[PDB]
């Protein structure tokens, strides 16, 4: 693809394939020209080395350097490693409908509810707001609904309050040591840019209030919402899986 | 060297090295100009680029600092746009797997997005427009709807 | 070091004692930095070995079990028998301490009431089923596992 | 001395 | 005794130990390094001169051709620092080198030069260090961090039984040169010596010795002693050196002169040794069975047949001795070897060694170095010569040679740069002695074995690399060159030097962006020591022995200032008094102490010399005589501390602050805080962002003035005088008569730096702190930079804090803030960001900056002028258009029913596409600067013309004002010098100004009366005209942009951010917290006077963290605020000035044997009133780190005030009105606002862009991307029963291309259902696996 600025970006497989093709063409030319045995053997060895480096660089001999300084990346290199396809792009993947910010206390909350900024919820539940606006007849077209949401009229807030009334969310801390690292809560619209977290779940989350952050995930389908309500709800797991003792005790 | 051997003549009295050097260097330079870049560039344009680089280096050494592309037209014989195009020719492409500091162990390829995809908002607008035009065409008479559907 | 620190935090520590304490502070920080990195690898290795185990049956119909006794090291007991028996299913029927009458039946779940009864009766050692003796193929049965210690 | 090397440059030389 | 700038506000000092050494300059390291890098040194010493002399003269392949060096010069920079910053270029200077080419005669080795060619060549550019020790690479400021690495030399390791199961120690040696190959010697469990080269396969140690032209007999002579055995009657009569019978076990009988000194089974003791020495016994009787294990020294050959009777280094037995004695030999010598003191490892190594001679050793070395290649004699000899005996490939520079000589216990400190046979033999003998037991191994963590490499040294190395790369090419060119057809300019290319310097300065691990958000952060970065980078260590490759503080760190490296995380203990910071030795080692000042008197002479001692003597402690009592009060003083001799006599003390510590760095020296009551908390507070002290207004820290340490003055953020008066003009952006100083040159117009003009953005998008502003007519002196502060007030450092604000729980709003670490704090704008910061619009050229046509944007309403462009650029000073919010831009669009596509829609509506498709620049969402501000750059050959627009006109007008105005200021000063000097001598009385003044100077009426004695002025006027006018012409030319000239771009427009936005919940706040004692709520004023607790509190903190964090420094500072701040309130009330009552004088004198005299002495009897009434007005908001108090105030002094100060001595008062609930039990500690303490702003962390996404290779979301907050669902989260969801949630997480929201759009359409339609589909990542993996020779497929059944 052409990079912004009139430049280009390429992968090392293109260069490996280029090398292989060029050496094969040279070998064909030398065979056609009845080259001496020593030259033919040298070309065959070069072709073997090129194919070996294409398949797995750095395995048989020294790795072939890339453009300037670094060695080339091969198919085996892409397959393997922590940054390989299996671990980085197939076992775990970035997802949509997610958000993160700083957490606060908010001691007035109940065990089954948390605090959520208005802007974060407005940004997250955009399709739901669009559908509700279309259904209520306030917006004729989805484009009109999007324009109303961008303008932030007095009715989009009511629509958001209606839709977030009984739709749980998922809160997760970046170290997930045990099962209780992800829990479900019932959002409450608040003013500000910080999430409020119940003090009782602080010990379970192993979180503090000195600049820690947490992630937010919105269940999409009906089955996911019901699973989050029936299994991942904070009130549904008060006992530690490791030992049969309470985990929401005051500190 | 094989090509030079195929055409060597010993009756001139000159040694074989003098005749072979020209052929060997010509073959090496032709191979370099042909298959040393990701994007192929013709031999004449490669020679033009090399000549421009040599001049620029000579003028930088003689005068004191980097000159301007406009001033190169006075030294050379160019319409002042060919030099600009040669300069605007893209260099060798950047590796996709190059790193940027630590960046949580991420490379350059993690920040390139596909521009060929269509937005779901656009797809929904298209579906809504299709439904609305179908509804509007149902209201018209059958012959009018048929002739419209045939025209468009 | 044969010379201890005789000043507390309320009083003023001197440069020598502060420099001495810096060694321990840096050792603690390095140990804390390395413990997480080791524990992550250990947890990953432990998760990846037992990810395919799923309860699939309800009762495999086995008679084996593990003999459970309190932990004695040569002094005061560090593990009462109530902790190691609560929530488990008994592999064989329990008898009276005096070997006179039949105690709690074989296939019962020992809750807090059963544990209190066993404590009152002063039973020496009750044997219980375990997952290592389960006869279920490709999984384990609920009875051998016992009860989930979260509900 | 037939082996103990990996680089083809040495064998060519 | 006090300066004018100090009389304004005097800080009370509670220290007791007198100061004898002033704090040195904190930025001396970089300045000194650059000044050693570039300077005209008339010697062959360090620098470019060095480099040049290291390569040139470059001679030809014996063609009587050499290019010889002569001199080097540096040119004037094209642009200054400000212009370089604005244009985004490098602030460097051209390098001019004067060379000379000489060609000798033909067929004459020493013939006269045929021709001489002298010319001057240009060789690259060299960046120049600014006045603050920084560099400018591309529009930005960068700081190079000093590197700490292992010093070159020889070191010995121990390896206490780690690689062997039996626990035997295996000693070894290693030689590390400055540039070359490594040489290693090591032992084995079989007591054999081995040698390694470049960590390759080990070879026997005798191979290199044989290759050094050494035979077996010479090796045995060198490495062993000789004992001679005779053949008299008995033939068993060897000489007996007395010291050869020590430490061994006796096995036979020794007899001399018919005396049995030792019987069977008896051990020779010291009595036997002294008896033999007294008897002078030399010849003894020995049994014939004793010679069974002996090894012959040399080889003996027969005289008849010339046969080798016995070879060297072989066991001698009865048959062998008989054979060599029947051939006519009378003198036999063997090797004296023991089992515990003289180990025969050389003989065993020789026996193992399979090589025969020098040739065999060379063949073996060549085979080891280059396996698979057929050895050649010449090739092996060249390789051996080049390995360690070639000056081009091996370097042993002065520091390495000195270390080698010191370790070898030599007498000279200078020598050759290559190794030698004597050196190798000495290292081998030292290793043998260490193995035997005499001697001790070295530790690599000793500060005496670690060297500091600086930016000058690194730049010199890079330049030398470039110079050798260039000399290779010049030799290649001169190999086939000529004599009278080339100039000394064609063979020199500045490209490799330029590339080397550019890559070194731009892309390097030690070249980092400067952290310019705090003067403390700026001064800390330049004093940073790193053990990483090229030639150092690696963060994951290091162990524990380098990550822990060593006893040698005392006084050189701060033990508590290092980052926590992956790199801890490798980014250490320099201490206050630490310096750098000539060879690059660290040293610290010390006070020389004679037999009884502690003198005031300062001596600098390195780490090696420190252990030799014994150093006393800083806090030692002495009464005005230098004698210690106590007969015993606690001192440290060698890495340990113990009691010592008074007369045995050799040195004393200079000060109590020499053990910590500048960052750690600014924490009051540091000794009362835990080490981890002190380190965290030091790490967090440099992250504070400057606030809108900063007054002063109520409790300090006294280093604030030094930190503010040493940094370049403030303005210091070069010369004393009287202020002539004051402005918000200019200060004019009239220089004193005795402080200025004989002839010149003496006037100093300082230009202040207005609002500008820093590397962290903060605000930099300078404000005057002087009035009109106020006298000034040298070193006085004239302008205050960011986070600085009255020439003192002020990172944050001081607040009234209370320690009590408040309805769980401060549960873990949260901080409760009252509404008045945000009402008074005490923590409001200004942020400035720069946005750029780029107009490039496309194949479809060039872009335009027009203002007719299609499908945009008129109300959406009202802030744009006719040229399409937003106005200066316009208020803009998120989504507002700043610069309008369009791009060509030709025949993209037409989907069905759109033709019908256009037919119905008669609409035309836009020819152009909207690509204008708009304000990012969620941010507002004001436009304060607009800059336009245009390429040559492109016509400028109205905004460009207006900007050019404004710039020309401003430049002309500034030049004219400065010129007329100079002329006004010159004419004032004219009048003064005239009146001083040879003037008319009241007639020369009436002369017109043009001719007033045109008098010379009496230069009779006053030669310069007008003489020194007209020349000054002439040069001033000429330079003004020339600078005007040059400046207008530079302004009117075009710019140099990258190919493909036409115009660039830069817009600057000023953003004012207030405090809100979610922001992070911290103190100076390692305590931090996030704001939770903002209560009204009426809700805050109040005292009996109705004064509410500002901050409410949780007491639950004090006992666990173990930091009483915050409590002590709170008490001290409360006492200081009480004193300030008393002063303010007395000023408000304005009774008299004697009462104020008496109160201030009492306050300044309160203490207990304090070194500071302040007397108000020499102060005038105006100065007393000024000081009283400056002390209204509280009297500042200085608390030295290890010499601060005590609890008794704090209580005495509180008693001086009207506040209770306990420090706790009674509070009432502002909600309920009822008092609180358990009185609450209330006081004032310093607070800081770290730049962990919540609005820079909040992010959310529903739909966006996806990556190219894998259709997955992008990163975070940069491309509007989503969070990452990791393996731990997957495991948590598998532990739960949320199978459907996991499926919708890893298929629909991430990878399924049809899944995501189908789900979006279903959600819009109101149906909450999904289709699972198939992830694209698995298809990509399948294709990648199929690209190999592996067949993988999915079958359907
Ligand atoms: C985020 C990152 C900085 C990280 C950091 O150190 N902080 C910066 C540094 C270099 C930047 C890329 C390059 O400009 C090329 C390209 C230009 C296009 O126009 C937009 C895409 C590209 C890939 C850019 C994305 C992003 O802007 C990068 C990765
Ligand atoms: C060297 C640096 C990484 C440093 C590091 O952290 N290690 C990387 C990170 C971003 C890279 C630039 C951007 O892509 C935009 C642009 C793309 C063009 O095609 C080539 C030029 C540009 C300027 C790039 C140069 C270089 O490649 C940069 C500076
Ligand atoms: C009062 C003083 C003379 C004192 C003396 O020697 N008698 C003269 C000499 C130079 C004069 C300034 C400069 O012109 C620059 C500037 C021009 C603006 O238009 C007005 C402001 C400025 C700052 C001027 C003020 C004033 O006029 C100055 C200080
Ligand atoms: Mg925390
Ligand atoms: Zn079972």
UniProtKB/TrEMBL annotation, chain D:
Cellular compartments annotated: Cytoplasm
Signal peptide start and end residues: none
Annotated transmembrane regions: none
Source taxon at top rank: Bacteria
Family: Belongs to the sigma-70 factor family. RpoD/SigA subfamily.
Function: Sigma factors are initiation factors that promote the attachment of RNA polymerase to specific initiation sites and are then released. This sigma factor is the primary sigma factor during exponential growth.
UniProt subunit comment: Interacts transiently with the RNA polymerase catalytic core.
Entry protein name: RNA polymerase sigma factor RpoD
The species this protein was found in: Escherichia coli
Gene encoding the protein: rpoD
Residues of the full protein shown: 90 to 102 of 613
């Amino acid at each position: 693809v052409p990079l912004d600025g009139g430049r280009f970006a390429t992968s090392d497989l293109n260069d490996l394939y280029r090398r292989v093709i060029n050496r094969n063409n040279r070998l064909k030319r030398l065979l056609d020209l009845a080259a001496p045995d020593i030259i033919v053997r040298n070309e065959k060895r070069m072709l073997q080395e090129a194919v070996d480096a294409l398949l797995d660089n750095g395995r048989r001999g020294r790795a072939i350097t890339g453009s300037n300084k670094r060695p080339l990346k091969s198919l085996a290199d892409m397959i393997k490693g922590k940054q390989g396809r299996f671990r980085q792009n197939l076992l775990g993947k970035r997802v949509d409908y997610s958000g993160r910010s700083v957490i606060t206390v908010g001691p007035y909350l109940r065990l089954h509810q948390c605090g959520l900024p208005k802007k974060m919820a407005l940004e997250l539940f955009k399709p739901f707001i669009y559908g509700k606006l279309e259904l209520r007849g306030l917006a004729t077209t989805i484009k009109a609904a999007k324009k109303m949401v961008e303008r932030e009229e007095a009715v989009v807030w009511d629509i958001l309050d209606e839709v977030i009334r009984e739709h749980p969310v998922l809160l997760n801390r970046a170290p997930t040591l045990h099962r209780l690292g992800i829990q479900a809560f019932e959002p409450v619209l608040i003013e500000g840019k910080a999430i409020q977290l119940h003090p009782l779940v602080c010990a379970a989350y192993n979180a503090d209030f000195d600049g820690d952050q947490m992630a937010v995930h919105v269940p999409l389908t009906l089955e996911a919402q019901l699973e989050a309500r029936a299994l991942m709800m904070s009130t549904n797991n008060i006992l530690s899986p490791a030992n049969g003792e309470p985990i929401i005790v005051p500190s | 060297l094989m090509k030079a051997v195929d055409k060597f003549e010993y009756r001139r009295g000159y040694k074989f090295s003098t005749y072979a050097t020209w052929w060997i260097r010509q073959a090496i330079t032709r191979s370099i100009a042909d298959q040393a870049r990701t994007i192929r560039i013709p031999v004449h344009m490669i020679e033009t680029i090399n000549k421009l680089n040599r001049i620029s280096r000579q003028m930088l050494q003689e005068m004191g600092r980097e000159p301007t592309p406009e001033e190169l037209a006075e030294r050379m014989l160019m319409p002042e746009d060919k030099i600009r195009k040669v300069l605007k020719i893209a260099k060798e492409p950047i590796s996709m797997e190059t790193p940027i500091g630590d960046d949580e162990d991420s490379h350059l390829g993690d920040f390139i997005e596909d521009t060929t995809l269509e937005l779901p908002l656009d797809s929904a607008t298209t579906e809504s427009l299709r439904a609305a035009t179908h509804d509007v065409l149902a209201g018209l008479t059958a012959r009018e709807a048929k002739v419209l559907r045939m025209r468009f | 070091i044969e010379t201890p620190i005789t000043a507390n935090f309320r009083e003023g520590l001197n440069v020598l004692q502060y420099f001495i304490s810096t060694h321990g502070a840096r050792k603690g920080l390095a140990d804390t930095a390395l413990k997480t990195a080791n524990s992550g690898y250990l947890t990953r290795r432990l998760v990846d070995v037992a990810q395919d185990l799923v309860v699939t049956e309800d009762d495999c119909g086995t008679h084996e079990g593990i003999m459970m006794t309190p932990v004695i090291e040569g002094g005061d007991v560090k593990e009462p028998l109530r902790d190691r028996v609560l929530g488990r299913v008994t592999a064989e029927d329990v008898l009276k301490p005096g070997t006179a009458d039949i105690l709690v039946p074989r296939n019962t779940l020992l809750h807090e009431q059963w544990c209190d009864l066993l404590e009152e009766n002063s039973v020496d050692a009750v044997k219980v089923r375990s997952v290592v003796s389960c006869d279920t193929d490709f999984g384990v049965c609920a009875h051998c596992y016992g009860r989930d210690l979260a509900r | 001395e037939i082996g103990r090397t990996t680089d083809p440059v040495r064998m060519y030389m | 005794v006090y300066s004018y700038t100090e009389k304004k506000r005097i800080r009370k000092d509670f220290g007791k130990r007198p100061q004898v050494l002033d704090v040195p300059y904190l930025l001396s390291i970089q300045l000194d390094s650059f000044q050693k890098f570039i300077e005209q040194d008339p010697e062959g010493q360090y620098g470019l001169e060095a480099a040049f002399r290291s390569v040139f003269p470059i001679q030809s392949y014996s063609g009587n051709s050499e290019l010889q060096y002569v001199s080097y010069r540096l040119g004037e920079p094209v642009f200054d620092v400000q212009e370089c910053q604005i244009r985004g270029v490098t602030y460097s200077a051209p390098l001019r080198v004067k060379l000379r080419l000489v060609i000798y005669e033909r067929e004459a080795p020493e013939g006269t030069v045929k021709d001489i060619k002298e010319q001057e060549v240009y060789m690259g550019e060299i960046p120049l260090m600014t006045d603050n020790g920084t560099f400018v690479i591309n529009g930005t400021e960068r700081v190079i961090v000093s590197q700490l690495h292992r010093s070159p030399g020889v070191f010995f390791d121990s390896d206490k039984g780690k690689t062997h199961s039996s626990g035997k120690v295996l000693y070894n040696a290693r030689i590390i040169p400055y540039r070359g190959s490594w040489l290693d010697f090591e032992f084995d469990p079989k007591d054999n010596l081995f040698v390694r080269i470049d960590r390759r396969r080990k070879l026997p140690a005798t191979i290199i010795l044989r290759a050094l032209n050494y035979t077996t007999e010479q090796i045995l002579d060198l490495f062993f002693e000789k004992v001679i055995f005779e053949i008299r009657d008995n033939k068993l009569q060897m000489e007996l050196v007395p010291e050869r019978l020590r430490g061994e076990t006796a096995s036979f009988d020794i007899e001399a002169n018919g005396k049995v000194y030792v019987e069977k089974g008896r051990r020779i003791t010291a009595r036997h040794i002294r008896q033999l020495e007294k008897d002078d016994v030399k010849l003894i009787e020995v049994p014939v069975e004793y010679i069974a294990g002996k090894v012959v020294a040399k080889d003996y050959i027969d005289e008849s047949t010339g046969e080798l009777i016995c070879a060297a280094n072989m066991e001698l037995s009865l048959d062998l001795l008989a054979k060599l004695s029947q051939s006519g030999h009378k003198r036999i010598e063997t090797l004296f070897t023991n089992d515990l003191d003289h180990g025969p490892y050389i003989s065993e190594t020789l026996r193992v060694d399979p090589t025969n001679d020098r040739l065999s050793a060379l063949v073996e070395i060549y085979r080891m170095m280059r396996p698979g290649e057929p050895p050649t004699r010449e090739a092996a000899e060249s390789l051996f010569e080049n390995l360690f005996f070639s000056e081009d490939r091996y370097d042993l520079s002065a520091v390495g040679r000195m270390k080698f000589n010191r370790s070898l216990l030599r007498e000279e400190i200078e020598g050759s740069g290559i190794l030698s046979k004597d050196d190798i033999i000495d290292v081998m003998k030292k290793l043998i002695d260490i193995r035997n037991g005499k001697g001790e191994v070295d530790d690599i963590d000793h500060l005496g074995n670690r060297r500091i490499r600086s930016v000058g040294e690194m730049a010199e190395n890079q330049f030398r690399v470039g110079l050798v790369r260039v000399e290779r090419a010049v030799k290649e060119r001169l190999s086939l060159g000529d004599l009278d057809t080339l100039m000394p300019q064609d063979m020199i290319n500045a490209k490799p030097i330029s590339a080397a310097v550019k890559e070194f300065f731009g892309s390097s691990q030690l070249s980092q962006f400067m952290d310019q958000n705090n003067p403390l952060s700026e001064i800390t970065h330049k004093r940073r020591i790193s053990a990483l980078g090229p030639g150092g260590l690696t963060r994951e490759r290091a162990g524990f022995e380098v990550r822990d503080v060593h006893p040698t760190h005392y006084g050189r490296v701060c033990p508590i200032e290092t980052p926590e995380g992956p790199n801890i203990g490798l980014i250490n910071s320099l201490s206050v008094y630490a310096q750098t030795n000539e060879y690059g080692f660290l040293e610290t000042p010390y006070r020389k102490v004679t037999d009884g008197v502690v003198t005031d002479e300062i001596h600098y001692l390195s780490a090696i010399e420190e252990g030799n003597y014994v150093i006393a402690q800083a806090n030692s009592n002495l009464d005005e005589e230098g004698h210690f009060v106590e007969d015993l003083v606690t001192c440290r001799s060698k890495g340990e501390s113990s009691l010592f006599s008074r007369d045995q003390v050799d040195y004393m510590d200079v000060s109590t602050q020499q053990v910590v760095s500048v960052g750690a020296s600014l924490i009051p009551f540091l000794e009362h805080d835990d080490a981890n908390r002190a380190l965290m507070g030091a790490n967090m002290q440099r992250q504070a962002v400057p606030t809108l207004r900063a007054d002063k820290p109520l409790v300090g340490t006294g280093m604030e003035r030094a930190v503010a003055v040493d940094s370049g953020v403030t303005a210091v008066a070069k010369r004393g005088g009287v202020v002539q003009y004051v402005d918000a952006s200019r200060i004019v100083i009239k220089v004193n008569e005795d402080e200025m040159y004989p002839g010149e117009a003496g006037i100093d003009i300082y230009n202040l730096t207005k609002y500008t953005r820093s590397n962290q998008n903060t605000c930099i502003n300078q404000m005057p702190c002087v009035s009109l007519g106020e006298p000034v002196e040298r070193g006085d502060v004239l302008a205050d930079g960011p986070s600085t007030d009255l020439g003192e450092l002020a990172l944050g604000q001081n607040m009234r804090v209370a320690f009590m729980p408040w309805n769980g709003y401060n549960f873990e670490d949260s901080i409760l803030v009252s509404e008045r704090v945000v009402q008074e704008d005490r923590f409001t910061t200004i942020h400035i960001q720069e946005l750029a619009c780029v107009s490039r050229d496309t194949k479809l046509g060039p872009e335009e900056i027009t203002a007719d944007i299609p499908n945009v309403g008129e109300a959406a462009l009202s802030k744009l002028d006719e040229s399409g650029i937003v106005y200066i000073g316009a208020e803009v919010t998120g989504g507002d258009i700043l610069v309008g831009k369009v791009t060509p669009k030709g025949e993209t596509q037409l989907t069905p029913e759109e033709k019908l829609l256009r037919a119905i509506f008669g609409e035309k498709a836009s020819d152009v596409k909207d690509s204008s620049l708009r304000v990012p969402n969620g941010v507002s501000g004001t436009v304060i600067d607009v800059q336009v750059f245009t390429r040559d050959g492109v016509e400028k627009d109205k905004r460009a013309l207006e900007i050019e006109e404004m710039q020309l007008k401003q430049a002309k105005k500034d030049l004219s004002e400065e010129l007329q200021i100079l002329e006004a000063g010159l004419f004032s000097r004219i009048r003064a010098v005239l009146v001083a001598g040879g003037v008319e009385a009241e007639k020369l003044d009436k002369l017109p100004r043009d001719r007033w100077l045109e008098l010379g009426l009496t230069d009779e004695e006053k030669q310069n009366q007008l003489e020194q002025l007209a020349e000054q006027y002439d040069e001033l006018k000429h330079e003004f005209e020339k600078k005007l012409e040059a400046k207008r030319r530079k302004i009117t000239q075009g710019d140099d942009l990258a190919p493909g771009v036409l115009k660039i427009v830069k817009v600057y936005l000023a953003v004012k951010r207030r405090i809100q919940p979610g922001d992070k706040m911290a103190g100076r004692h390692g305590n931090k917290g996030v704001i939770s709520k903002i209560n009204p004023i009426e809700d805050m607790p109040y005292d009996e006077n109705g004064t509410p509190v500002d901050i409410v903190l949780n007491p639950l964090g004090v006992p666990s963290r173990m930091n009483i420094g915050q409590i002590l500072e709170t008490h001290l701040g409360m006492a200081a605020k009480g004193i300030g309130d008393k002063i303010n009330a007395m000023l408000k009552q304005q009774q008299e000035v004697a009462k104020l004088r008496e109160f201030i004198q009492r306050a300044y005299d309160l203490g207990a044997d304090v070194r500071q002495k302040v007397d108000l009897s020499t102060f005038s009434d105006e100065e007393v009133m000024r000081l009283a007005e400056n002390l209204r908001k509280g009297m500042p108090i200085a608390t030295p780190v290890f010499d601060g105030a005590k609890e008794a002094e704090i209580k005495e100060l509180l008693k001086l005030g009207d506040l209770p001595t306990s420090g706790q008062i009674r509070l009432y609930d502002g909600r309920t009105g009822e008092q609180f039990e358990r009185p609450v500690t209330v006081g004032y303490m310093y607070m800081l606002k770290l730049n962990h702003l919540v609005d820079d962390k909040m992010h959310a996404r529903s739909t966006g862009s996806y990556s190219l290779v894998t259709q997955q979301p992008l990163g975070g907050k940069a491309q509007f991307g989503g969070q990452r669902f990791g393996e731990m989260e997957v495991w948590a969801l598998e532990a739960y029963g949320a199978a459907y949630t996991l499926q919708e997480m890893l298929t629909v929201k991430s990878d399924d291309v049809n899944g995501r759009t189908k789900m979006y359409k279903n959600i819009v339609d109101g149906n909450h259902q999904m289709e699972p589909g198939m992830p694209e990542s698995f298809n990509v993996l399948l294709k990648e696996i199929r690209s190999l020779g592996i067949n993988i497929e999915l079958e359907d059944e």
